[model samples]
Target: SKYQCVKLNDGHFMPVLGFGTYAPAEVPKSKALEAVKLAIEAGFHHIDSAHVYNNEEQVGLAIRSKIADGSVKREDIFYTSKLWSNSHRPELVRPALERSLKNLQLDYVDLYLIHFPVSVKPGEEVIPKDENGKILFDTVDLCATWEAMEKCKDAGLAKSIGVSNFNHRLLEMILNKPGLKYKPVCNQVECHPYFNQRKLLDFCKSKDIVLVAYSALGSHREEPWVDPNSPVLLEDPVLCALAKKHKRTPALIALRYQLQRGVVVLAKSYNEQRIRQNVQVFEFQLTSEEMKAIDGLNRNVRYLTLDIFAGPPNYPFSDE
Candidate 1:
């Protein structure tokens, strides 16, 4: 089955099933490359990359090898790279994209996103600040950065532009920005059975902006971030029972629930068998009763917390 796409305000279509590269640094490059190759082989057209992941070069290598072997055409691959907070300036934007392109070995990215709404000092890493120290970065207007993103599209550096981790207030500000040329095509956020993001998803849908869900399988294996107290979604009694009823695994049940609801889901796994299992969700349909049961599983729990940026500077996660 074909993945869904939403027409952007700029008239380009973005594939819904994006493969996220948020794997940790400790994960070996070979294993990560194998998983990405498997993802593309299994029909995932969109590959998401970021500088923080430290795997863009490996991911690019896998994609290039795939194209060289005639496994997938270059245009069929929808690659996305992000602009880190430190590189939001207009002049720095192209250079940042160039870094990603050089790493991925691609001429241009399919979609480029502003990784976060926050800006950082040129040399500072935008991680969580310690109690004694604060993140040192001069604030920059998001609109100004967005204007630079438009410049990337105009320069044929990116096919489309979007944002990630933006809240409703930030999105509203973008919508109201004067002389905005290209509207954001998608918003990538943390979404799963426990953290459904219903209101925000509805708002994006209403405005014709596609919502891409990361951590769709609860991102349980995420290191330095996964909370021990966070409810294990794959072990949920409701999902477990439903999976049994449907003769599918609990993870597939959860992913199918998202697909049936029209939200784009990204399932990341380094395990070969699990990666193959995750792709099978496309073969079956979840009944309406199953959908309702899955919807009832929403407890509004966010597994990934941006507590790293909590304080006076006004980060999005700080508000809630």
Candidate 2:
């Protein structure tokens, strides 16, 4: 296989490189379909999307179209969808995954994740805000949510169940639950040369859980979510010098750096050229010294602060 797959703790395999299908709300929904198709053509088999992203239909259609054209089979594709904050209750967990499956028009998702550790009031609005612009928060126990997530796997709605944006303590909460059935297969978070997440990565690795990296290129710097003052990861002197040394784009160095560290990275881009260039991450290797230089560039910065959900009971970013 041209794609190198890491064996998940659940015994299923996931591609090391994945295509992130997150288009901001302002972007046309139709763009997801086009971007996903281009990603497949560019040699990406793992497609990462979420219920919050609100583009499952288009992402699913793109995968089906690729299957129809004989480019790949459904089984060859590793599709991951996430459970939104509103669906944190034990009762709502399976239904949330089902809703995503309905939108994706697929029998099941390869991986289903609890999108955020925080709980919001289950309702019509995605963010569910009141007149004062405060998030309507809920107080469901995350252990109960994890039980429902386990049930999803048992019922075959999701092949592997995991969480995103969860801190180490939160992971321990699930791990130390009274009647734990399955441990999380991965923890997807903001990881890049800037926000390396070394401690979390080491913790997840010790537990045999894969640490998936979102914002591997330091995010798109989308407005209203990403802080405008965040440093550009792709423009860092160390990364640019490494790119020059390898005769590759700085983005390639960023992506390859994670691959060398055993972290599954999701590179989100709608542009066709960048999508194609992202696939080149597997073509080159970084020396140990180069890897060390990149490691020193970690400044413990995160582009996606997600501060809107700060006051929730299970706010994950506060600790780690």
Candidate 3:
């Protein structure tokens, strides 16, 4: 099978599938250097990283070193990074992205997203908490912040700009802005058969926007952020059964399911075989009836609730 790309509203092409480098909320840095090394070797040209993940430096190193060794070129790879919630202030947006570029040691990133819909005070702590344990949020004008993000794209620091973990209401905040210079090219969120974002997906598609799915697998390995009681997405009997029919792994079935529906998907894995195994998503096809059965598995569940990220004035999930 060959690789694929997702066309954006801005006429840019992003890889249909990407490798994620999130080492858990507590770990300082992941094996992103080696993981991404194998990811690139495994034929993935798109990579996802975030400042909050604390692994951008290694991810950057892996990409650059790979290019230095002559297998990949700078333009051949599509890199995506995000602005942390702490840098939500409009004035701090460009600097925050610049810092990521410094850590990445690159001129620019292919895409940049506002990591969260809410804002936290900018300081030494990326996620600042008070003595009472409630988060200390600094209110910001999202339109103003979006304007700053627009500047980043205008100046060519970012090829495209978008948001992550945003809900329909929050997305409307940017869409309805009076002087919208640019609309979001994509919205990245946790999605799988267990929590198919059908409503959000339809809304974005209607607006000519792409929906990028992260946590496409079960996300069994992640903790603290996800509900420990949530059912494993990959282990679902329905998905497993579908895999049996298609002769593919349940993970690939889930990935292909999203692709057939036009959702760009991201698969997070550090294991070499899983990374290589994941690229086979395009190798098979799922029948329409199979897709319907998979859709029926949605329980309106969210593995990553960002429950800790609650209470901000514009909390995306407050009414959802």
Most accurate candidate by TM-score: 2
Which segments of model 1 are wrong by more than 4 Å? 1-4, 124-133, 221-223, 312-314, 318-320
Return whichever of 1 and 3 wins on TM-score.
Answer: 3
lDDT per residue (tens digit) for residues 1-320 in model 1:
36766566568877666777667767687776888899888878878878777788888998998999899898788888888988877677888888788888888998899887777766546463437787765577788889989888888989999989888888878888999988788888888888788888998888777788888887855656777778888999988998888888898987888877778778887777777777788778887787887888888688877666554353776433
lDDT of 2: 0.92
Global lDDT of model 3: 0.88
RMSD of 1: 2.1
Error of 1 at 129 (Å): 7.1
Where is the poorest 10-residue window by lDDT in model 1?
311-320
Overall lDDT per candidate, in order of appearance: 0.80, 0.92, 0.88
Candidate 2 wrong stretches, greater than 4 Å? none
The deviation in Å at residue 183 for candidate 2 is: 0.3
RMSD of 2: 0.9
lDDT of 2 by residue, 1-320 (tens): 36889999999999999999987778998999999999999999999999888899999999989999999988889999999989899999999999989988899999999899988899868898889988898889999999999999999999999989999999999989998999999999999988899999999999999999999998878888888788888889988888998999899999999999999999999999999999999899999899899889878688887988888667888787
Which of the predicted structures, 1 or 2, would earn the higher TM-score when compared with the native? 2
